[PDB]
Write a protein that binds this ligand. Structure first.
Ligand SMILES: [Cl-]
Ligand SMILES: [Cl-]
Ligand SMILES: [Cl-]
Ligand code: NA
Length: 219
């Protein structure tokens, strides 16, 4: 039933409230997703001024229901949706804790996020804005989390640093349905995401334009 909500192009709205080392900020994003081709197109702005962290560190936080149709937990949870929570551990640096609700509100798929970052170095790669404006593709293994009627995933993200090094970000993820309704649990499978970051030449606010392709593969 939920998968039928994704037969065409679906409008997306994203809202994030963040606090990293006491630096508070908010983000709004808008665009669309197409599960037929696994394509996401979104623009995000910081609505509070300068973004105090690099845009690439927010990519994974800022809708896996759009993975290209190859049983899908993320789609079957809709329209009631799912909670997505992560801890992201930046090597030699701080950690993010995120909680989000992803659900339909009318025709729009809405991702509403709270993010708290702690224990960051003010001069490190994150708060010091030392990361390149790109995002390395990753193949993520999605597994059933039977004890919570949802899924889990653990994976590394490597952010390119402006000195040629990499900043590792260990991701720990758990998703659980919001509704009491039935949901499909997937076979363990991989999602390949490949991302292109760009700028809107007419946007004066701190912002990110994002194009992503998400494809699924079995075992
Ligand atoms: Cl604004
Ligand atoms: Cl800043
Ligand atoms: Cl950035
Ligand atoms: Na700032």
């Amino acid at each position: 039933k939920g998968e039928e909500l994704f037969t065409g192009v679906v409008p997306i709205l994203v809202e994030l409230d963040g606090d990293v080392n006491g630096h508070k900020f908010s983000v709004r994003g808008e665009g669309e997703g197409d599960a037929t081709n696994g394509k996401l197109t979104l623009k995000f702005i910081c609505t509070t001024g300068k973004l105090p962290v690099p845009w690439p560190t927010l990519v994974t936080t800022l809708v896996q229901c759009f993975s290209r149709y190859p049983h899908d937990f993320f789609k079957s949870a809709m329209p009631e949706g799912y909670v997505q929570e992560r801890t992201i551990s930046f090597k030699d640096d701080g950690t993010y804790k995120t909680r989000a609700e992803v659900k339909f509100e009318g025709d729009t798929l809405v991702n509403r996020i709270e993010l708290k970052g702690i224990d960051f170095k003010e001069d490190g790669n994150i708060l010091g804005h030392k990361l390149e404006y790109n995002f390395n593709s990753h193949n993520v293994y999605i597994t059933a989390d039977k004890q919570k009627n949802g899924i889990k995933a653990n994976f590394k993200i490597r952010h390119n640093v402006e000195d040629g090094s990499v900043q590792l970000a260990d991701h720990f993820q758990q998703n659980t349905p919001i509704g009491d309704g039935p949901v499909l649990l997937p076979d363990n499978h991989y999602l390949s995401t490949q991302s292109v970051l760009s700028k809107d030449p007419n946007e004066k606010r701190d912002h990110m334009v994002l194009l992503e392709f998400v494809t699924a593969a079995g075992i």
